[PDB]
Design an enzyme around this catalytic site. Sequence first.
Site, PDB file in Angstrom:
ATOM      1  N   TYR B  26       1.145  -1.619   0.041  1.00 54.05           N
ATOM      2  CA  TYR B  26      -0.004   0.046   0.534  1.00 54.05           C
ATOM      3  C   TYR B  26       0.848   1.296  -0.008  1.00 54.05           C
ATOM      4  O   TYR B  26       2.385   1.004   0.137  1.00 54.05           O
ATOM      5  CB  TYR B  26      -1.308   0.272   1.089  1.00 54.05           C
ATOM      6  CG  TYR B  26      -0.275   0.172   2.613  1.00 54.05           C
ATOM      7  CD1 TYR B  26      -0.061  -0.762   3.322  1.00 54.05           C
ATOM      8  CD2 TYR B  26      -0.414   1.526   3.118  1.00 54.05           C
ATOM      9  CE1 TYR B  26       0.979  -0.488   4.646  1.00 54.05           C
ATOM     10  CE2 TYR B  26       0.749   1.875   4.388  1.00 54.05           C
ATOM     11  CZ  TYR B  26       1.178   0.674   4.930  1.00 54.05           C
ATOM     12  OH  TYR B  26       1.450   1.106   6.034  1.00 54.05           O
ATOM     13  N   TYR B  82      -9.394   7.992  10.376  1.00 52.54           N
ATOM     14  CA  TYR B  82      -9.187   8.580  12.121  1.00 52.54           C
ATOM     15  C   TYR B  82      -9.589   9.654  12.921  1.00 52.54           C
ATOM     16  O   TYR B  82      -9.294   9.437  13.986  1.00 52.54           O
ATOM     17  CB  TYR B  82      -7.525   8.792  11.895  1.00 52.54           C
ATOM     18  CG  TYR B  82      -5.954   8.326  12.045  1.00 52.54           C
ATOM     19  CD1 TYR B  82      -6.028   7.440  12.864  1.00 52.54           C
ATOM     20  CD2 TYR B  82      -5.967   7.903  10.590  1.00 52.54           C
ATOM     21  CE1 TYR B  82      -5.097   6.280  12.887  1.00 52.54           C
ATOM     22  CE2 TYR B  82      -4.403   6.633  10.479  1.00 52.54           C
ATOM     23  CZ  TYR B  82      -3.827   6.529  11.531  1.00 52.54           C
ATOM     24  OH  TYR B  82      -3.206   5.464  12.041  1.00 52.54           O
TER      25      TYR B  82
END
Lengths: 434, 107, 175, 70, 688
Positions: B26, B82
């Site tokens: 990633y 987040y």
Amino acid sequence: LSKKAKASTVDLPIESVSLSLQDLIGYFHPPDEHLEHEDKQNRLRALKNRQNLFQEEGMINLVLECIDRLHVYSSAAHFADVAGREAGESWKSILNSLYELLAALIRGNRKNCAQFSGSLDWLISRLERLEASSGILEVLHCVLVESPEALNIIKEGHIKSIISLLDKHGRNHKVLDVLCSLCVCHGVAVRSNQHLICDNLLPGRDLLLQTRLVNHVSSMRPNIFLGVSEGSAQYKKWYYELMVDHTEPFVTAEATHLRVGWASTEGYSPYPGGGEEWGGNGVGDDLFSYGFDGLHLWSGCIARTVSSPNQHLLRTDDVISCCLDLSAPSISFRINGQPVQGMFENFNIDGLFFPVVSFSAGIKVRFLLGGRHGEFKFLPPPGYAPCYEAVLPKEKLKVEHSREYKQERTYTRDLLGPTVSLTQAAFTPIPVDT
Amino acid sequence: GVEIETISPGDGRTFPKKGQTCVVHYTGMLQNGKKFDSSRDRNKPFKFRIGKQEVIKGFEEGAAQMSLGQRAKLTCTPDVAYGATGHPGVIPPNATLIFDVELLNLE
Amino acid sequence: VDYNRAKWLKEPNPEAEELFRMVAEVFIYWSKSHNFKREEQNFVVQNEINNMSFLITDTKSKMSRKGDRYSMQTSLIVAALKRLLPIGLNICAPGDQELIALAKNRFSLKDTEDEVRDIIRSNIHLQGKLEDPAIRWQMALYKDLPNRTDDTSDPEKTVERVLDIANVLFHLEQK
Amino acid sequence: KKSSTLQQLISETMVRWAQESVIEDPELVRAMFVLLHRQYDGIGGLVRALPKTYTINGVSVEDTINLLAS
Amino acid sequence: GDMRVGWSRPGCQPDQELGSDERAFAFDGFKAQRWHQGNEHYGRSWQAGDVVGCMVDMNEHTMMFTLNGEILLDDSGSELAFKDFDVGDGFIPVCSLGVAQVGRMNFGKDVSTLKYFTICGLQEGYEPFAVNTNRDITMWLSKRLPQFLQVPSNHEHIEVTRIDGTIDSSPCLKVTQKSFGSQNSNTDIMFYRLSMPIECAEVFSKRDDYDFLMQTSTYYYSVRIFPGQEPANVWVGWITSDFHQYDTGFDLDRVRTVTVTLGDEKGKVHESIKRSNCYMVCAGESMSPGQGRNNNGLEIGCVVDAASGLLTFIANGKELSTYYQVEPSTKLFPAVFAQATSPNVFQFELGRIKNVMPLSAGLFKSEHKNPVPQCPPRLHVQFLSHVLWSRMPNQFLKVDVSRISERQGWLVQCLDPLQFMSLHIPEENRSVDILELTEQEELLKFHYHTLRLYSAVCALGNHRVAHALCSHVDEPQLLYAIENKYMPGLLRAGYYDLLIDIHLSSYATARLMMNNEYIVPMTEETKSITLFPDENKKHGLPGIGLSTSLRPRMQFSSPSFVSISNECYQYSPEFPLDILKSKTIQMLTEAVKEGSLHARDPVGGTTEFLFVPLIKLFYTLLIMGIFHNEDLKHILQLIEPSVFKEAPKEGLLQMKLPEPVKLQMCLLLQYLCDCQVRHRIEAIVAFS
């Protein structure tokens, strides 16, 4: 002067204060490094004794009071409107000299810095003011370097004020030095200060300069120039193909760059315009180029995702057909014969266009320009002409670097000056008026 | 709550299941394009197991609905990435995250 | 010399060496004689020779007030000496030119023939430390191609060449 | 002859540096002379090391490692 | 043709003719002339294919030029082209090429390549400029694309006055023409902008009121065109960082533009985006109805709604018909394009109007909810300028292009990877190669202190901060900075220190702190230890051997930012130790070989910058104990080939090092002595 008693009865000793501040700064001047060691030590001892005597007599508080009384005013003109032109002409200089005197008084003296730790909070409250920012920063640096109690006094609000000083006053390395002193002093780290500075300075990525590794990107174009004008003899619609024999998606940690499309010159000059020439930027990274990457249409360094049957990034065995219609300005693409549901249009047509491919390392591609320069895999759309038909009769079709400088020995590298305009590219015959 | 664009198609049949370990590469990117994380930078494929709350949940669903060998761009809203707290020192508060995830292997 | 200079540079010529030796004494006598100065000045002004006209005619094919009648700087003798100087420079090497240089400085501090000769003879012995690059890699890279050599020069002829090139250079830098 | 030994090499090197130049760095001077004294006082190295030397059996190795970590 | 060649001072301007000032001494063979602060006749004219040898003697302060070996002569008999110049900051080779002119500069890195050096120059004690160098000399050439840079305080024509905002006024940045009403005045158009951009919303959502003023994402600024300045010569609006179009004749009809049209599978255009780098209006057409043109200074107000990306304009309390719609995430710089027709041209006014926040609120995040207009010192006026240099890369991509056949077309192939480290300026939305900081000084200083702050925030085992810093400086960046030879010395030292502090300092400190304690388990491995390797009482190589004393365990964590375990915030972040060790050994060998010959171009610019960071990294790895056996033998042979030889090359010890390098070598020898002491202690325990 305050309390609204402005008159000639005021007793400001402006010149006397300036001279005394200069004399005191010279009195507390640190020894030169060029001196002999013992003389330097004697001068340092005398300086420390002077600092201790001044601190015991309470001169630091007097300097602070003078600074406060000068700071009740906001500008030199504002001060002069109450005290007079002569006092206004030296308000700034007197403030600077007072801050320098304070810094010299407390510099290198742990006891003086520990005593100033109490007033440290009041010092930062005026850090934002332009006339005192440098002096306050110097005093803060000295205090933080010499006294751990200053670090203990420092809290989150002061650190955020310092970071706001970075944000508002630009890039100043003395602020970074102050933050370093906040982080570490005398070999003892302050975890709270370290965490605060990290969490309040790093994630923004808007003040400190950002670093990154970028793949070098080169460009290739045929020696073809396509342009449309009034009375010109040039055809308006053109077509070409690029087919990929091999592409490694990740030669390095950064994704391989491969874009194909058209690019325009800056007004008949053969040199491609609007972009740099070394590396990092490719087709569609400026407003002079128009590129396709398999999933996105690129222009002006901005990418828009475009739909296509089984859309994917350009890979092995992919054929891209690029069509340029200068009649009504349009650039269209067809991937493996399937149309791409996107199009460039209404771009500037003052200049010369050419096929272009931009790439990083890790490709094998082939230009197909029609005729004897690459047979087309797909039938070109009606009206469009193969790109090889645009070769001037004297010249020969050739694929070369889009820029002037390539990998070569330095002593054999050809340095090129400015190039003549290709005004002959657009053949507009103007007969003599009769 | 996350959504996926294909970049390179996968096999299209094999998908992560519960109790399986995805091995992926990633490249974490902020919405403005600033890279904040990359497993390819460390030259170490990232291994995480499905359903154990090991990673951020948006990345979790993205990898779950990707297929074997597939490469995809994952867009994750702050609420699944987040939230308002962010990651101290890395991710600012309320930041949308873009990942370039290639699902290498399923163990 | 200006026409054929490159050829002697490529192929060293004893005739060119003799010509350089020849003009060395011409130059030193030119520097020493004092009445000769005003005498040449008078001879030139009586001839009304442009002096620089020969160089202008040379550089004419290649297109290449206060001092209209005559000039110190463009004397024919010093012009010939400076045109033949590359021959001396190619014959010589820096490896003895360092002691030739303090030979010029001894001449500047007024050392005459005997002390100059004996000081050179004494200080040829000063060898370096066994790396010293400029000298050894120059001479070694040049002569490791074994067949061609100039080593057949005698120490006394080397001393005489040192002396005459040193005095030519000293007089040239004086004037 | 040649040094052929680390102690001789260091003893030669420190003296050669010191007599080759006037060192302007007090830290460098102190480091050089500390190293030279160490070379000439090899007994003192053991005199310092042995009191700080302790041996353990094979069954206490892991516990000693954990204690050292703490 | 029109080419000049010679020696330039470091401050030479790229857009001025060589020798047209005091900053360069040049020879021009197009007209057979010499150039310094003027023009004089010197030498002849070259033809095509000639070689001009440029010669400088900084001892005698002389300059000479040779054409195909033959020395060019002045109009007088002087061979010297220039005779009396101060050394100053020095001289560098320089050349200037005109239209369609081609030249090649040879610095003589390979002396055999010089064509006429032997004919003239070799015998005169003239050294080639790059004779004592290991790598090719970096080349800097005048930039083509103009860039926006702050107006200098010593500018010939442009002067900027900062006016503070009073109670009854607003902050103003006034642009004035210094040289108007005097000749050589610049009648050409100038392009000014503000140093900071307004950034539109990332995603577009399809007295005054304080709540609305706080919730709004609309910002305002204005431009006052003074009386006497023609409004038809002034344009007001916004530009992006892509704007580089310096044209004497500027009009709104010739700005760069494009339209991206996206439709469905069968026609059905579903969106059209109009993209451009210039969103501005002309004051002359903005006036529109009948005014006196001078009753009050024209006040063109620009309003940007970032939440919707909408740009609107106000002529005089009256909304204009011209409007723009920008794409999301666009960064727009306030800009004014003006052709000065008066000593006073215009002034930025950073105020606000009803229900609109001021420009400072959107420019600075700290003032995001401050209605009071502000003009902080960071915000300043920049102008489009051509006085800039570009650094030619030392290496280009190797691209092979060839006509395979008539049927197969033209093959372009590129396989060898190549990368560069990019430094991004956030406020200016631009990027440069980090190797341009060799000539950019303020950026170099700020970035060096930024690296120092990076070290400080993670100093002394702050593993959480080290993990966070791994996001900002990744290991490819660290490795590239370590290995690069053209990095500035300050940046090289900073990056070496950053690598050591992030990845190695904690464990190195742990081992150094446990160094003087010897806990020796009593095992068979311990019992097998002997003082000497064989019967011959010959010392073994220090460090090499079997050591059984207890050592701290070395553990590292993966710096992943997608995980939420948090259990990795103990231990330092992981780094490739094998790769680091191999690179360190190779770089140290290369450094020893290159510094043996005393080159003029050491890595970092000085021998200190070349050796101190490299030796520091090597010593840190040695302390950590990563090296083993053959690597130890190689490093010991690098330190001292003679003593550590196993039964003309000189090691670092016999290398004439600077004092910091000597101190680091002292540290290395101290560690070797400590290894010997540890081996002695282990042997004593084994015997005991």
